Amino acid sequence: QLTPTFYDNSCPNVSNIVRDTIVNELRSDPRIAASILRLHFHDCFVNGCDASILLDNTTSFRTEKDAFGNANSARGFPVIDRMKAAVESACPRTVSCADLLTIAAQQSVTLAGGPSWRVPLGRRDSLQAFLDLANANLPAPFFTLPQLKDSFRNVGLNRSSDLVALSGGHTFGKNQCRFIMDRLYNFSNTGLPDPTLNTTYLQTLRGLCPLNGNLSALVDFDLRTPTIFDNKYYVNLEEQKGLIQSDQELFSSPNATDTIPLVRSFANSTQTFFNAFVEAMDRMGNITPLTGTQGQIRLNCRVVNS
Numbered sequence: 298q299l300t301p302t303f304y305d306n307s308c309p310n311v312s313n314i315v316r317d318t319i320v321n322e323l324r325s326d327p328r329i330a331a332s333i334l335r336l337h338f339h340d341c342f343v344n345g346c347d348a349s350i351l352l353d354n355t356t357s358f359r360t361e362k363d364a365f366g367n368a369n370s371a372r373g374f375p376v377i378d379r380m381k382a383a384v385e386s387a388c389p390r391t392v393s394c395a396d397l398l399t400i401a402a403q404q405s406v407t408l409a410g411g412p413s414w415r416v417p418l419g420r421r422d423s424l425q426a427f428l429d430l431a432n433a434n435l436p437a438p439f440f441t442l443p444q445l446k447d448s449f450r451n452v453g454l455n456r457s458s459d460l461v462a463l464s465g466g467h468t469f470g471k472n473q474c475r476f477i478m479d480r481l482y483n484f485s486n487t488g489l490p491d492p493t494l495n496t497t498y499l500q501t502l503r504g505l506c507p508l509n510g511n512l513s514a515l516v517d518f519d520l521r522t523p524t525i526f527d528n529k530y531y532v533n534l535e536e537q538k539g540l541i542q543s544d545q546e547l548f549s550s551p552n553a554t555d556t557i558p559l560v561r562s563f564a565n566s567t568q569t570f571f572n573a574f575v576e577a578m579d580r581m582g583n584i585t586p587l588t589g590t591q592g593q594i595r596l597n598c599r600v601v602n603s
């Protein structure tokens with residue numbers, strides 16, 4: 298069983314070291330908090346939160362960094378290396394990369410203005426990386442609501458609250474133009490923009506992402522508060538201003554009978570959202586962890602101990 302007090306004796310300063318690292322990084326890179334939260338999400342959805350995503354290529358297995366959902370998208374790896382080194386200095390061979398990334402994600406949310414809580418700890422590091430599983434398990438922005446639900450259920454998160462609350466991670470961070478081009482100019486081969494996208498916002502997005510333009514250009518997930526972790530993400534959905542298809546479907550999908558009331562509840566109360574986010578975050582953080590003597594306490598998050 299994972300427990301929040303796992304390192305209270307072996308490394309009481311772990312959370313503070315993680316926090317300090319993120320605070321320093323945020324000065325030069327204001328997007329790092331969002332990036333780190335996403336790394337934890339992509340770690341947990343592939344064989345569980347086992348730091349498998351942090352592993353680099355080997356001649357025996359490919360890195361998850363080359364998965365469609367990670368390649369030229371996932372970032373912050375050097376920052377994780379930095380805090381790991383700092384933690385290894387303070388507490389040699391004690392804190393796993395899996396736990397480190399989980400704490401990093403929580404501290405990132407808190408630093409961005411979100412809720413503060415102690416995440417369960419005790420996870421251990423994987424002995425391999427899973428590229429094929431990452432390609433299969435990571436959800437895509439073009440997924441329909443049924444597909445999004447399927448993706449979450451596939452890894453162990455059955456609740457619509459899990460999906461709606463965790464999607465709130467898009468209350469900050471960036472998204473490439475490439476992922477919304479269809480919504481803007483030719484949605485589902487209709488030759489028309491996605492009808493669930495507010496027409497005024499449509500114009501704004503088209504200006505940021507012109508047809509035949511730079512597909513790697515970045516746009517804010519939350520037009521209200523781009524870098525603050527708050528419930529504004531849901532207010533946007535209510536006005537048909539979710540950025541990607543997967544965001545707006547939580548409110549507009551024909552299959553959203555169960556998700557609409559959740560979107561409204563989170564848009565109506567910060568407390569309700571934050572409570573749900575922490576609950577869902579801990580559930581995601583409890584996905585098939587290696588514990589006890591299983592796996593290792595990786596010294597270098599990029600490679601398995603030898």
Ligand code: HEM
Pocket residue numbers: 328330331332333334335338369370371372436437438439440445463464465466467469470471472473476541543
């Ligand atoms: C429900 C399905 C989800 C889909 C389809 C999805 C899709 C995406 C896409 C397309 C991007 C843009 C990547 C890029 O342009 O490089 C992204 C970014 C992001 N996602 Fe998600 N996401 C989902 C769920 C989540 C969850 C559960 C979290 C965390 C709790 C999360 C947190 C983030 C953050 C913070 C960013 C910004 C990262 C950065 O700016 O570096 N996402 N997501």
Ligand SMILES: [Ca+2]
Pocket residue numbers: 339340341342343344345346347348349350
């Ligand atoms: Ca993983």
Ligand SMILES: [Ca+2]
Pocket residue numbers: 468469519521522523524525526527528529530
């Ligand atoms: Ca926000």
